């Protein structure tokens, strides 16, 4: 058994992390107090769920997790919330004042003063790992902490844990729920600095989650709670292969092997189905062919883009529930003749398929109906570069007039880091064009 440490940075990372660990506990039968009746080995063991949970002599199942934020109010809710008994106080790290939506403040000014405390707390977790795989890092692009402190942390983790894989779950900014005008700046700055330190990154555009919540869950104005419960379902289907017995994506390195042939092009598009309103009185259970076909609908993607106008490099189908390989193959055959699914010439046209028989768990009283089968498709398509183009364009509009740049320089960042980061993004866009055009 090989352990995984989850790191949750800033408000978005912390609140999504809470959603995830609530869901993990429901999926594994762990009570809020940490007890797990079905675990017959007290205070030890190396089962698959032990990759995410350590155990105390008292039978408490403790998340291998660290929460970090530069102000205390979000993590305070964890300290006094339903799952407060779950976490050790050392795992919950708060500063005094936040990065004020300023990458330079989170990275240089405040990050310098807190980075060593965070690494010390991570080392305490690592010291209890017989074979650490690496890290799963949750954070927003747009926040000052999520962007700036995360990029510093990723750099230092490459130093302290050079042989360890690092995966990201990154919240891409959407004006409908965004809090800062400078989020395009923070997103480009943190992508440039993190790019060589992240092996695989799952971007989630808040706009897509927002619209899925409105359209499929009939929520008039979705809140972060609505968004985070949907996001945790997708995160859970992505990380289930690390937490349950299986043969596909059983370790962090396998995400890179199966999804990222080119190191810079390490942003797989996630698509999830079905998303069904729990308020619906009568539900019609979608078939394997129907949820598999929904994976090629832009309306179900975590980032709105058009895969018909890019090329695939890799494609993984992750089913949960009542699914057998016979029906998946009959579905894939049908879809191939009716959909625009073009791979790059130097890659096989194929799918790696994983099935977990346990259906998706839902939070009691949440917005998501229980379904008998669900699927998350992870696909590395060049079409996700549309998201970079949108982001780089908003950057260009503001940076041409140097709007807000003085906030960053006032924190000791050089103005040249803007153009250096933007040039890296220009080369990233060109890389996607070379692969897919």
């Amino acid at each position: 058994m090989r352990e995984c440490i989850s790191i949750h940075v800033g408000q978005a990372g912390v609140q999504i992390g809470n959603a995830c660990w609530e869901l993990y506990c429901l999926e594994h039968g762990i009570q809020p107090d940490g007890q797990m009746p079905s675990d017959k080995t007290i205070g030890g063991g190396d089962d698959s769920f032990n990759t995410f949970f350590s155990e105390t002599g008292a039978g408490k199942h403790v998340p291998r997790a660290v929460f970090v934020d530069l102000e205390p109010t979000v993590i305070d809710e964890v300290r006094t919330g339903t799952y407060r008994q779950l976490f050790h106080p050392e795992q919950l790290i708060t500063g005094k004042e936040d990065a004020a939506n300023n990458y330079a403040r989170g990275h240089y000014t405040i990050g310098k003063e807190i980075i060593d405390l965070v690494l010390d707390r991570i080392r305490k977790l690592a010291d209890q790992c017989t074979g650490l795989q690496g890290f799963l890092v949750f954070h927003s692009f747009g926040g000052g902490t999520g962007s700036g402190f995360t990029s510093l942390l990723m750099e230092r983790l490459s130093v302290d844990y050079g042989k360890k894989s690092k995966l990201e779950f990154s919240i891409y900014p959407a004006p409908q729920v965004s809090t800062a005008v400078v989020e395009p700046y923070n997103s480009i700055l943190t992508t440039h600095t993190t790019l060589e330190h992240s092996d695989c990154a799952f971007m989630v555009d808040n706009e897509a989650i927002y619209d899925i919540c409105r359209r499929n869950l009939d929520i008039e104005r979705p809140t972060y709670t609505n968004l985070n419960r949907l996001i945790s379902q997708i995160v859970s289907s992505i990380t289930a292969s690390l937490r349950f017995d299986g043969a596909l994506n059983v370790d962090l390195t396998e995400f890179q092997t199966n999804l990222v042939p080119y190191p810079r092009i390490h942003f797989p598009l996630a698509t999830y189905a079905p998303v069904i309103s729990a308020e619906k009185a009568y539900h019609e259970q979608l078939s394997v062919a129907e949820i598999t076909n929904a994976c090629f609908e832009p309306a179900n993607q975590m980032v709105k883009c058009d895969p018909r106008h890019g090329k695939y490099m890799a494609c993984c189908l992750l089913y949960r529930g009542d699914v057998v390989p016979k029906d998946v193959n009959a579905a894939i055959a049908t879809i191939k003749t009716k959909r625009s699914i073009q791979f790059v010439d130097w890659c096989p046209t194929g799918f790696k398929v994983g099935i977990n028989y346990q259906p998706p768990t839902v939070v009691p009283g949440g917005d998501l109906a229980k379904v008998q089968r669900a699927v998350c498709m992870l696909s590395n398509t060049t079409a996700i570069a549309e998201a970079w183009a949108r982001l780089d364009h908003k950057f260009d509009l503001m940076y041409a007039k140097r709007a807000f740049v003085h906030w960053y320089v006032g924190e000791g960042m050089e103005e040249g880091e803007f153009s250096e980061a933007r040039e890296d993004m220009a080369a990233l866009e060109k890389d996607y064009e070379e692969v897919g055009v």
């Binding site: 809090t179 800062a180 972060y224 503001m398 007039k401 709007a403």
Partner: protein, 427 residues
């Protein structure tokens, strides 16, 4: 976390006192410092503006400054006068004679150290101080001259904290002395350099609103101050109640100020309601939105239709449909997209608080960083120049040791500010 509030001079203390009356009521604090509210949303961020004293007593983190005792005697005698910390009253006897030089250089310089003693004591007992807010006028002597002296001294001791002001701009329509353009130009010179956010509250706009909109034949300062305290309550709502957006002074400044000198905001409020006047009619979300963007509802006497918005913050208060608020806010931007600069994408941010202000079921507060604010500084500059080209009334200032060169520099800096707004109005 904590904010330290300073109010200086007659105008600053009269609007400051009404500000504390209003928000004390919203947070359920009675005139004796006891909490008597029914909602926990009232206490969740109470420490932003109030210290906790034993006996469950909440005391405003407020410093009251003046160079004459009169207005602050009235504050002690007023409705909520017993709520202020008696050690936080700092006052002289001589007055400032509506003279910026007396406030800034002679009379105010004698009193400034003991104000900083009280500021230091309040800051030292702060868990994590955000910064400072100052209320004052620019047209007199204490609030304008000593207020800006205080700002400079506070920046020197707390260079990494945010400095915010509510600055009342003088107008010939509501004027006490002819030297107001001098005091205001000297003050703007200071504000451009040493504040992070300044709310420009124009007595010209306040009068016009009382007269034309509220149908008050003879507006008094009390009527003017009713609009200001309601606006101050609105613009601080995001700091005082739980919320996601512009929740502290620094995040607000980062969202609102694209260039450090252009930090002068036009505030507005809807619905406009006068003193003691109860209108019981429900105001729909479309009506709130249209009225808060309406030129007639702005409290800096400039026409936003003549300029472009760099940034906008809107705060809705009361129980209402958040879907409707989003729809109406997008409706205004999509239908009138020319009034918002295209090189700052998504520059309008909306916040919503459940707790409405007293007397209203719903309201909306507007904070705009519009290039049309140049019209306010143009107006002051013309009134300054009409007198200064004849050196009229200057002896009041040279008698305090000032030189004419300091006037020329302050005028030059304000005209530069005007030019910088016009630059981004055409960009």
């Amino acid at each position: 976390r904590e904010i330290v509030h300073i109010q200086a001079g007659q105008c600053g203390n009269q609007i400051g006192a009404k500000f504390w009356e209003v928000i004390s009521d919203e947070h359920g604090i009675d005139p004796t410092g006891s909490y008597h509210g029914d909602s926990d949303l009232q206490l969740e961020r109470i420490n932003v503006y109030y210290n906790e004293a034993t006996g469950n007593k909440y005391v405003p983190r407020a410093i009251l400054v003046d160079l004459e005792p009169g207005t602050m005697d009235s504050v002690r005698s007023g409705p909520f006068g017993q709520i202020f910390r008696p050690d936080n009253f700092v006052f002289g006897q001589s007055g400032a004679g509506n003279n910026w030089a007396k406030g800034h250089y002679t009379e105010g310089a004698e009193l400034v150290d003991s104000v900083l003693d009280v500021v230091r004591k309040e800051s030292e007992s702060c868990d994590c101080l955000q910064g400072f807010q100052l209320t004052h006028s620019l047209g007199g002597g204490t609030g304008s001259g000593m207020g800006t002296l205080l700002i400079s001294k506070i920046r020197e001791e707390y260079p990494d904290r945010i400095m915010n002001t509510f600055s009342v701009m003088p107008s010939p329509k509501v004027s006490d002395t002819v030297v107001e353009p001098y005091n205001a130009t000297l003050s703007v010179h200071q504000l451009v350099e040493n504040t992070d956010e300044t709310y420009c509250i124009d007595n010209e706009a306040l009068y016009d609103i009382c007269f034309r909109t509220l149908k008050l034949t003879t507006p008094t300062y009390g009527d003017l101050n009713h609009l200001v305290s309601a606006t101050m309550s609105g613009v601080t709502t995001c700091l005082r109640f739980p919320g996601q957006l512009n929740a502290d002074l620094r995040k607000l400044a980062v969202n609102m100020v694209p260039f450090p000198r252009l930090h002068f905001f036009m505030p507005g409020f809807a619905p406009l309601t006068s003193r003691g006047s109860q209108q019981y009619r429900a105001l729909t979300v479309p009506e709130l939105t249209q009225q808060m963007f309406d030129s007639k509802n702005m409290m800096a006497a400039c026409d936003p239709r003549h300029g472009r918005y760099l940034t906008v913050a809107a705060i809705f208060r009361g129980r209402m449909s958040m879907k409707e608020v989003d729809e109406q806010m997008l409706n205004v931007q999509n239908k009138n997209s020319s009034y918002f600069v295209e090189w700052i994408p998504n520059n309008v941010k909306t916040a919503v608080c459940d707790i409405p202000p007293r007397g209203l079921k719903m309201s909306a507060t507007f904070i705009g960083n519009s290039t049309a604010i140049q019209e306010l500084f143009k107006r002051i500059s013309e009134q300054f120049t009409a007198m200064f080209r004849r050196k009229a009334f200057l002896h009041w200032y040279t008698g305090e040791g000032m030189d004419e060169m300091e006037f020329t520099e302050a005028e030059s800096n304000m005209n530069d500010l005007v030019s910088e707004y016009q630059q981004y109005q055409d960009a």
